[PDB]
PDB file of N, CA and C in Angstrom:
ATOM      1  N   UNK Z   2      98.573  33.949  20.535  1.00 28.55           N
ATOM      2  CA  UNK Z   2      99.245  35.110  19.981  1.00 28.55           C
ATOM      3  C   UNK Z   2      99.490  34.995  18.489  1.00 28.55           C
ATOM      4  N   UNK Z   3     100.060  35.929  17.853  1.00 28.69           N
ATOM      5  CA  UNK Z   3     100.572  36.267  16.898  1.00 28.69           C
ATOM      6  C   UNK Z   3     101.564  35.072  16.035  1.00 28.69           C
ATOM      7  N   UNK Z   4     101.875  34.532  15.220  1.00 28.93           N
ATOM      8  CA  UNK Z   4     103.171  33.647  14.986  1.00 28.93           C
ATOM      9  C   UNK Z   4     103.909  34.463  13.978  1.00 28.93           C
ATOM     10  N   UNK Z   5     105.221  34.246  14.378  1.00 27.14           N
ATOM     11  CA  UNK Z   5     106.053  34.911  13.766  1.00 27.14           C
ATOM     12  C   UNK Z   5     107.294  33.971  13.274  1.00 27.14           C
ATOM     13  N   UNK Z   6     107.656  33.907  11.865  1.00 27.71           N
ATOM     14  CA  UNK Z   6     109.225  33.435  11.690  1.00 27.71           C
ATOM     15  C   UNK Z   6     110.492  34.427  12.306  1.00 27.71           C
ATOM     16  N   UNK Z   7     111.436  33.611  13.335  1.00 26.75           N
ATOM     17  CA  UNK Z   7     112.707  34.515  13.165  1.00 26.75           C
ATOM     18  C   UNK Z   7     113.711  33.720  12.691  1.00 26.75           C
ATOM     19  N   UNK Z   8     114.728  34.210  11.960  1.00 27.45           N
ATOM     20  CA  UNK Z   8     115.615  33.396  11.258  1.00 27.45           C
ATOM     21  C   UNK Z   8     117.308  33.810  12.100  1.00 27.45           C
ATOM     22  N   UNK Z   9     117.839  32.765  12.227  1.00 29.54           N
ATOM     23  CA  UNK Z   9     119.800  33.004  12.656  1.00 29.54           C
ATOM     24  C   UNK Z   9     120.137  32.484  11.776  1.00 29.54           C
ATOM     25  N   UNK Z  10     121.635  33.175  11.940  1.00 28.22           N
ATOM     26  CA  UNK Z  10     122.679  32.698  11.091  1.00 28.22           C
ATOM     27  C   UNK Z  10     123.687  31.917  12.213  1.00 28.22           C
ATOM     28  N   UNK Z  11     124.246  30.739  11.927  1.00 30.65           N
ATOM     29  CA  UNK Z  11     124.939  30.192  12.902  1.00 30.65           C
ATOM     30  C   UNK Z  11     125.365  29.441  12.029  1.00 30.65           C
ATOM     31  N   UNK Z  12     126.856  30.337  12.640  1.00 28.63           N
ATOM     32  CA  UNK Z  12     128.133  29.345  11.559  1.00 28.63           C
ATOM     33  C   UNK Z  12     128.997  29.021  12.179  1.00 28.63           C
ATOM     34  N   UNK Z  13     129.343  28.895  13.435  1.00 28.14           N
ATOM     35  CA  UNK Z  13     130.106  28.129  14.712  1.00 28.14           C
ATOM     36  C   UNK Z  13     129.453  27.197  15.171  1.00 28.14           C
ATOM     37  N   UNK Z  14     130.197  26.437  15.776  1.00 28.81           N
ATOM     38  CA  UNK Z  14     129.666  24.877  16.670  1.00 28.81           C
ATOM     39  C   UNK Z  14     129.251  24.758  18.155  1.00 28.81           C
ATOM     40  N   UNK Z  15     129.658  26.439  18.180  1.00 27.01           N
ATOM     41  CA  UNK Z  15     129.273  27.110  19.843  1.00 27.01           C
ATOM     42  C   UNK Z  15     127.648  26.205  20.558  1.00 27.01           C
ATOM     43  N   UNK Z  16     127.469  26.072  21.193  1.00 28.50           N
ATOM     44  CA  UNK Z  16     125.738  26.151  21.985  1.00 28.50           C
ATOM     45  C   UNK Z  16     125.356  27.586  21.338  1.00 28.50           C
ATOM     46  N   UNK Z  17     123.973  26.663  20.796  1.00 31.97           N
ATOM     47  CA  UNK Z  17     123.182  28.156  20.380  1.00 31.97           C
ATOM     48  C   UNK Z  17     123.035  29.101  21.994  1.00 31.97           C
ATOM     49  N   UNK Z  18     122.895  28.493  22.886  1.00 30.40           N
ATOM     50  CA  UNK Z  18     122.217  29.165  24.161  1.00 30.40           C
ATOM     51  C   UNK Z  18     120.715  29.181  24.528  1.00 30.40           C
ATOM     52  N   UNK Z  19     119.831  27.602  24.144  1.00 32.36           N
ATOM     53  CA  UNK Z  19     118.573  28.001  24.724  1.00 32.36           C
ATOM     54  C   UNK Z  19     118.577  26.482  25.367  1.00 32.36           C
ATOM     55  N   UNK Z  20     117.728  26.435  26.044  1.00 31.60           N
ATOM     56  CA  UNK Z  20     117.294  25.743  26.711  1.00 31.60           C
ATOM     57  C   UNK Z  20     116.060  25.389  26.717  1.00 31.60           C
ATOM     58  N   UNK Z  21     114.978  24.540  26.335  1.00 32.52           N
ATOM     59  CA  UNK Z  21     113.698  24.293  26.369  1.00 32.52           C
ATOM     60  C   UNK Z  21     113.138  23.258  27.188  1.00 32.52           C
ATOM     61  N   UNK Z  22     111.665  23.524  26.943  1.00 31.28           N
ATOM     62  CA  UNK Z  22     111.524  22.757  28.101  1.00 31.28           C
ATOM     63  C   UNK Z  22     109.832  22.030  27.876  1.00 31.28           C
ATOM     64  N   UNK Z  23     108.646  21.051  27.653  1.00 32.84           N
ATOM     65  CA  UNK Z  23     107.541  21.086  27.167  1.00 32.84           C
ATOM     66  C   UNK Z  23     106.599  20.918  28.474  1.00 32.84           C
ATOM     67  N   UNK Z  24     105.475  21.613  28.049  1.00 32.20           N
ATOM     68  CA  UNK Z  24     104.482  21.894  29.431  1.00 32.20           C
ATOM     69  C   UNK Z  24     103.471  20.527  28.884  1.00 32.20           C
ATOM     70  N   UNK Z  25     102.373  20.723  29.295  1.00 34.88           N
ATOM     71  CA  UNK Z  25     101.152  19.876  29.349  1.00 34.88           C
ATOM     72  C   UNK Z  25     100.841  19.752  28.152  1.00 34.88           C
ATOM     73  N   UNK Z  26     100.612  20.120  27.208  1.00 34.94           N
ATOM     74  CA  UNK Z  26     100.056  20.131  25.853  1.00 34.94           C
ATOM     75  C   UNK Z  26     101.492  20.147  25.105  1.00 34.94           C
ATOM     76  N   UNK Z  27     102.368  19.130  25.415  1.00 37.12           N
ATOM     77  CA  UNK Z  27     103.725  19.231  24.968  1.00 37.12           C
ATOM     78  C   UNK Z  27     103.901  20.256  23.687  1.00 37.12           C
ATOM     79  N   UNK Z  28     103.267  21.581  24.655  1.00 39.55           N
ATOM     80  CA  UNK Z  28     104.254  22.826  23.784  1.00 39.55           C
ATOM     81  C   UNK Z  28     105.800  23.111  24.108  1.00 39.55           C
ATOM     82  N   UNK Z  29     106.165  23.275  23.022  1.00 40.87           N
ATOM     83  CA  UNK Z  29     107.935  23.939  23.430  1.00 40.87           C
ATOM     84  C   UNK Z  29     107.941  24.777  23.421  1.00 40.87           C
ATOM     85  N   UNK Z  30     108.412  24.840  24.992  1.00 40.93           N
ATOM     86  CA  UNK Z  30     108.205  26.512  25.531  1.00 40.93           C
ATOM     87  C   UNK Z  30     109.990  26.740  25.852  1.00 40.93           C
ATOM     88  N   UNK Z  31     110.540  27.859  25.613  1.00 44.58           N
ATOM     89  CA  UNK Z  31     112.193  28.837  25.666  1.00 44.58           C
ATOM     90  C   UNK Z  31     111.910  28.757  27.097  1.00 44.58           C
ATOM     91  N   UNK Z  32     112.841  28.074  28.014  1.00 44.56           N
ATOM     92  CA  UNK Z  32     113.152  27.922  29.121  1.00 44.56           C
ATOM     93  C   UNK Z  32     114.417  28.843  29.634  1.00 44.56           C
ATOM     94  N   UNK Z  33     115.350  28.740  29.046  1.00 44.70           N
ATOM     95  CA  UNK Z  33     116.077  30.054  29.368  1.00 44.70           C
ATOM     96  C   UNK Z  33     116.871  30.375  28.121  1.00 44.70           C
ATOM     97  N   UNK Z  34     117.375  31.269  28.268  1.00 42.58           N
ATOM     98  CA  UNK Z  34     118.378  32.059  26.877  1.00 42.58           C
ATOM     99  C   UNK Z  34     119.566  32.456  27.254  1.00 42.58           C
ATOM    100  N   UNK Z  35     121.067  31.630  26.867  1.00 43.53           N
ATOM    101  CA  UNK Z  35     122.194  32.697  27.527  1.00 43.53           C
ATOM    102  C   UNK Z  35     122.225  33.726  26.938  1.00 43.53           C
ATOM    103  N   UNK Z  36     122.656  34.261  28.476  1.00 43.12           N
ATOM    104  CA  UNK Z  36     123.255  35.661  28.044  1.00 43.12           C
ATOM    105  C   UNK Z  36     124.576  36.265  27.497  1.00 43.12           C
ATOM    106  N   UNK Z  37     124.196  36.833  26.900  1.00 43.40           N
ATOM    107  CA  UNK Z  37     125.660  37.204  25.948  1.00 43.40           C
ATOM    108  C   UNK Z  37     125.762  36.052  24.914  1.00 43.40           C
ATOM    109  N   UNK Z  38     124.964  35.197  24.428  1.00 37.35           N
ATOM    110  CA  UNK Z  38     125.006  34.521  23.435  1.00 37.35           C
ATOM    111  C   UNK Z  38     124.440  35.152  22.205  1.00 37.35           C
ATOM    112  N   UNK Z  39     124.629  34.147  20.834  1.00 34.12           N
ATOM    113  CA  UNK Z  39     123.867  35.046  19.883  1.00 34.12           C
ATOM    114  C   UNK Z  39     122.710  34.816  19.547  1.00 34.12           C
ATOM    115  N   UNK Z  40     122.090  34.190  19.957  1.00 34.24           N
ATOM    116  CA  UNK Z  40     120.601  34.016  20.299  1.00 34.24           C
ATOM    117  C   UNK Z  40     120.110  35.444  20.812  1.00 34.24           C
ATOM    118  N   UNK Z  41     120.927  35.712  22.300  1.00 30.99           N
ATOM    119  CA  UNK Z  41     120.302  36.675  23.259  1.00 30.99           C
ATOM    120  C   UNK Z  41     120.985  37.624  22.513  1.00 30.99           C
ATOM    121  N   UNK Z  42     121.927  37.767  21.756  1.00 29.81           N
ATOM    122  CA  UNK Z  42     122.568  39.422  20.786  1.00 29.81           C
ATOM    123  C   UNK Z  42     121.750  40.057  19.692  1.00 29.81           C
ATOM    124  N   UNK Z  43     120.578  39.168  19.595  1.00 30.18           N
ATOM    125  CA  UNK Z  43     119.846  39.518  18.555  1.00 30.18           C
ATOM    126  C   UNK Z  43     118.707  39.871  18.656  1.00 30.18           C
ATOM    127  N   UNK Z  44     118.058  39.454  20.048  1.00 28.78           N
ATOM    128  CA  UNK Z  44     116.909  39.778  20.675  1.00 28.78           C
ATOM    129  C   UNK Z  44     115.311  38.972  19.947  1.00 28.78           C
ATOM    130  N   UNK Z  45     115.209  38.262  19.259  1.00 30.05           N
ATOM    131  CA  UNK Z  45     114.351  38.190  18.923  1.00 30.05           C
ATOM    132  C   UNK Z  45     113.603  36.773  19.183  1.00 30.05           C
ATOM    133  N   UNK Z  46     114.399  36.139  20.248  1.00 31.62           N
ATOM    134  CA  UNK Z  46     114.049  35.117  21.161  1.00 31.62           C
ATOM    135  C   UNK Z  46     113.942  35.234  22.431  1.00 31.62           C
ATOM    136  N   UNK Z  47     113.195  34.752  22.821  1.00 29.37           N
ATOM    137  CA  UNK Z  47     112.859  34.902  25.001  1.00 29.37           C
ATOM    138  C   UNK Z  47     111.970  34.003  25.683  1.00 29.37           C
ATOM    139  N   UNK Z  48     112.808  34.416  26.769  1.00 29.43           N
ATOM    140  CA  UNK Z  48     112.133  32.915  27.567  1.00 29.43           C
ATOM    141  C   UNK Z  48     110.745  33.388  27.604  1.00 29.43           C
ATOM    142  N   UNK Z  49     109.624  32.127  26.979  1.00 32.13           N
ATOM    143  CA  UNK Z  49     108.415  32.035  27.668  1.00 32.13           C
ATOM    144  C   UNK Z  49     107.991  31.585  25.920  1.00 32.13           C
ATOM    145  N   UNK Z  50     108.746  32.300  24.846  1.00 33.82           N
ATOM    146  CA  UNK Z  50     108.008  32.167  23.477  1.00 33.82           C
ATOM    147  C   UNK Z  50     107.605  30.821  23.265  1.00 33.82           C
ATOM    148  N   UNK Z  51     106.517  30.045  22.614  1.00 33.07           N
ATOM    149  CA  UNK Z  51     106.589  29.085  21.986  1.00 33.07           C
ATOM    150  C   UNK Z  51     107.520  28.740  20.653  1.00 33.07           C
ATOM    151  N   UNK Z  52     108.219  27.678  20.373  1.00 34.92           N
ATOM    152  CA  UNK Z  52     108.245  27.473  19.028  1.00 34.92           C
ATOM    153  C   UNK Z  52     107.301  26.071  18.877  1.00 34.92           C
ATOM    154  N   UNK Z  53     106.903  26.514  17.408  1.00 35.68           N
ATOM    155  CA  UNK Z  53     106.261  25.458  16.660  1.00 35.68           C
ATOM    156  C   UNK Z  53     106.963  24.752  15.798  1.00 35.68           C
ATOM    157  N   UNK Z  54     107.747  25.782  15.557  1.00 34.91           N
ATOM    158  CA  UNK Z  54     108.674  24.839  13.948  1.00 34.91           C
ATOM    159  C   UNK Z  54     110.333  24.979  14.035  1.00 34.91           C
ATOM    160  N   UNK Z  55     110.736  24.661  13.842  1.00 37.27           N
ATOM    161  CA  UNK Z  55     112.425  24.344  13.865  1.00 37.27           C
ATOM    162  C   UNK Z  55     113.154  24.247  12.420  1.00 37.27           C
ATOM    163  N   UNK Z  56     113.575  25.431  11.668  1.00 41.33           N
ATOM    164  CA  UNK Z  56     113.983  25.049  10.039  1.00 41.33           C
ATOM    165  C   UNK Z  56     112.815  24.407   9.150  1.00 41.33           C
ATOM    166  N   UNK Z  57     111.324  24.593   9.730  1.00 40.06           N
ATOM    167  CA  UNK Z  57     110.182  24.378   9.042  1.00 40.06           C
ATOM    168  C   UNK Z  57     109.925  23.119   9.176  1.00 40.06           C
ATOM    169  N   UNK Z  58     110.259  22.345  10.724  1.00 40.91           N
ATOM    170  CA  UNK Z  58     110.072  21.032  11.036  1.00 40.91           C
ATOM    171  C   UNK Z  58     109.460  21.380  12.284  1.00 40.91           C
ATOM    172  N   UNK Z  59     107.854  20.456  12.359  1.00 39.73           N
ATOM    173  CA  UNK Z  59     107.258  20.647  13.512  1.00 39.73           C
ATOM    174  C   UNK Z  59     107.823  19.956  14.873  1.00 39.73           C
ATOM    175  N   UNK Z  60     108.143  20.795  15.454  1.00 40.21           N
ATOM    176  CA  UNK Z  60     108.202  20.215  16.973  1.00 40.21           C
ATOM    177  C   UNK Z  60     107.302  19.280  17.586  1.00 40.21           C
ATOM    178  N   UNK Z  61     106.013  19.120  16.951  1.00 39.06           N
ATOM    179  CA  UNK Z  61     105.293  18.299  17.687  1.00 39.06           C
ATOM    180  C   UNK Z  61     105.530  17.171  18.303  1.00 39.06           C
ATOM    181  N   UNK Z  62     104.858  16.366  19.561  1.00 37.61           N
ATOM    182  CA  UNK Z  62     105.249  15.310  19.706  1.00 37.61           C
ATOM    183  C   UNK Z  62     107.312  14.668  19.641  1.00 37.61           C
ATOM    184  N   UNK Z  63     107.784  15.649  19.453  1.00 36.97           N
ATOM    185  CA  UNK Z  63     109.070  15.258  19.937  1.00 36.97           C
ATOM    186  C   UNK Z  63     109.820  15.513  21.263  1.00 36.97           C
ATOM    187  N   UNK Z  64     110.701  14.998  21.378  1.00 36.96           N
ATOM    188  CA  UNK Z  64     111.085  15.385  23.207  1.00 36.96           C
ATOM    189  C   UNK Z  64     112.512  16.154  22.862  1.00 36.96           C
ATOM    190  N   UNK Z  65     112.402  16.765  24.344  1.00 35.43           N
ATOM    191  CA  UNK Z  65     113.512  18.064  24.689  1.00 35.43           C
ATOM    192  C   UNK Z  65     114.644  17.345  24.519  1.00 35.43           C
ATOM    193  N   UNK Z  66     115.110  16.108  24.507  1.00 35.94           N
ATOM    194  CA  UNK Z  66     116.413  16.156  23.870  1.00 35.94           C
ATOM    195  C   UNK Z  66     116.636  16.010  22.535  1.00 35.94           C
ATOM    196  N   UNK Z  67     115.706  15.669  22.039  1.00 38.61           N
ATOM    197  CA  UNK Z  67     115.952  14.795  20.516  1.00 38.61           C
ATOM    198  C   UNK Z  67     115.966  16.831  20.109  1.00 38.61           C
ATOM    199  N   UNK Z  68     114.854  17.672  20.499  1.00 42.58           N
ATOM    200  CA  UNK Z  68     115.185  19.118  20.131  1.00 42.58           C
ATOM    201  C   UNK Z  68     116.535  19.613  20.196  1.00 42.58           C
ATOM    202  N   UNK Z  69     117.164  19.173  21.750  1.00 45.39           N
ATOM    203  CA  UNK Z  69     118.144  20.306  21.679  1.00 45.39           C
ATOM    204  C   UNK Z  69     119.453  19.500  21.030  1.00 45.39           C
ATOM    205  N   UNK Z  70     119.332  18.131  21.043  1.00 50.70           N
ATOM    206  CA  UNK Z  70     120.628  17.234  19.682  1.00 50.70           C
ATOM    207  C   UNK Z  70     120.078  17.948  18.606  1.00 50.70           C
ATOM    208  N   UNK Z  71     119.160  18.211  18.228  1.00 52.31           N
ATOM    209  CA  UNK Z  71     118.716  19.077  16.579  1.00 52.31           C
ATOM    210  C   UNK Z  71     119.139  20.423  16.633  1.00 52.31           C
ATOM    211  N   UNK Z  72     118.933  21.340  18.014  1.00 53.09           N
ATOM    212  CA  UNK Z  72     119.622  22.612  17.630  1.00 53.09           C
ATOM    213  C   UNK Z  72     121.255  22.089  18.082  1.00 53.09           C
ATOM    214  N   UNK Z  73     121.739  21.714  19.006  1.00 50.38           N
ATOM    215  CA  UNK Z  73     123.387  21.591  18.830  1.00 50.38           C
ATOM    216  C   UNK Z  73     123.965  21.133  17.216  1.00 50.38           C
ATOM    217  N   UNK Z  74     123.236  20.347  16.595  1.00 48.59           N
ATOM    218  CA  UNK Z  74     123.904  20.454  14.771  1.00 48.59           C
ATOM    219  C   UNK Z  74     123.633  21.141  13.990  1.00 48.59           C
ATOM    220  N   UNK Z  75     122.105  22.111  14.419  1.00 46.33           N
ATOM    221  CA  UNK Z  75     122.137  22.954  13.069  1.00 46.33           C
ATOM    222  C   UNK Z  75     123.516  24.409  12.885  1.00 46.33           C
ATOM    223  N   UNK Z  76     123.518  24.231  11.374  1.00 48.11           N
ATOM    224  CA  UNK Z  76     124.701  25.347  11.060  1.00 48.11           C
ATOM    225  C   UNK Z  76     123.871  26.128   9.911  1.00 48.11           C
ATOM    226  N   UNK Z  77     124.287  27.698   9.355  1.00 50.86           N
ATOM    227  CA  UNK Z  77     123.806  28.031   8.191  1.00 50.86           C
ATOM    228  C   UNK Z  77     122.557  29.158   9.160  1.00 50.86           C
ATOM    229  N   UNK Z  78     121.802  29.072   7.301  1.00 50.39           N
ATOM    230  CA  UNK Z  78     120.561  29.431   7.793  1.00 50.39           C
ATOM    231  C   UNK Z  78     119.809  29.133   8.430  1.00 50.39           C
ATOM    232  N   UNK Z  79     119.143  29.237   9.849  1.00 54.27           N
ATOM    233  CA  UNK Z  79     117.962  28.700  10.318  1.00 54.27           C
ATOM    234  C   UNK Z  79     117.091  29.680  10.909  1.00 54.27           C
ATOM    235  N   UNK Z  80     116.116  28.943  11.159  1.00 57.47           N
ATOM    236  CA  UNK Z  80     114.378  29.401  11.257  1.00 57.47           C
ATOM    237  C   UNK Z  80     113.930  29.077  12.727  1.00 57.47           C
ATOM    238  N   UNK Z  81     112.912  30.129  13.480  1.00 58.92           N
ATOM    239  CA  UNK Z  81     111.776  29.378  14.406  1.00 58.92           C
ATOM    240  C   UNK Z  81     111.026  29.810  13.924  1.00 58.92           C
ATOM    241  N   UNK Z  82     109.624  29.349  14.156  1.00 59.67           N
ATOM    242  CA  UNK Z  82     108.569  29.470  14.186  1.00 59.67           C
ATOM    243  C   UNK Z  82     108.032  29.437  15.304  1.00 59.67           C
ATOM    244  N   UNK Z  83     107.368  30.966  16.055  1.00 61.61           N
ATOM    245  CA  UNK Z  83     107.236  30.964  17.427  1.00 61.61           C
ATOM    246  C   UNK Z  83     106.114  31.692  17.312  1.00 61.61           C
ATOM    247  N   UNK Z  84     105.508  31.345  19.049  1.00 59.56           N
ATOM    248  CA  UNK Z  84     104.514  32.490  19.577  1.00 59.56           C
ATOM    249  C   UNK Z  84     105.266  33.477  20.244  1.00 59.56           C
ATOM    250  N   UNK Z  85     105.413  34.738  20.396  1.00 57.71           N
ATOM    251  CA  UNK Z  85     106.047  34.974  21.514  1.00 57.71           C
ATOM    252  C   UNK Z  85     105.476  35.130  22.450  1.00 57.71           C
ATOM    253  N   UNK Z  86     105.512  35.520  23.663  1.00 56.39           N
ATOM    254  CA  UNK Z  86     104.737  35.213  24.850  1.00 56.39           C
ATOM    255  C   UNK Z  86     105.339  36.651  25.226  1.00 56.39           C
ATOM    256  N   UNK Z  87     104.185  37.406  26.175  1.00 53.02           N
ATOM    257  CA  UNK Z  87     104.337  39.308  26.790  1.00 53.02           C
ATOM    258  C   UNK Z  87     104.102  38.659  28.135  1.00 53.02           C
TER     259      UNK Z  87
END
């Protein structure tokens, strides 16, 4: 598909609200999204998208926790870099 940047603003210490998860070709694939979070208030994340990049840091080769300890500290501006998936 298509790649697209989407950018949040996250300035609380809340859980962003995603959950990921890596398939066979350790892509990081959006495993689920809470609801009523601000992830899911903004719409421009969903389960199934790839991300590639994280604040313009490749996901490659890293594992689902060392990801989601990286999104539980980010604050400010941040970035994905995703496929989205229809």
């Amino acid at each position: 598909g298509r790649v697209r940047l989407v950018q949040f603003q996250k300035n609380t210490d809340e859980p962003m609200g995603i959950t990921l998860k890596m398939n066979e070709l350790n892509h990081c694939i959006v495993a689920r999204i809470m609801h009523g979070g601000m992830i899911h208030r903004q719409g421009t994340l969903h389960v199934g998208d790839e991300i590639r990049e994280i604040n313009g840091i490749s996901v490659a080769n890293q594992t689902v926790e060392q990801l989601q300890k990286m999104l539980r500290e980010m604050r400010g501006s941040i970035t994905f870099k995703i496929v989205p998936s229809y």
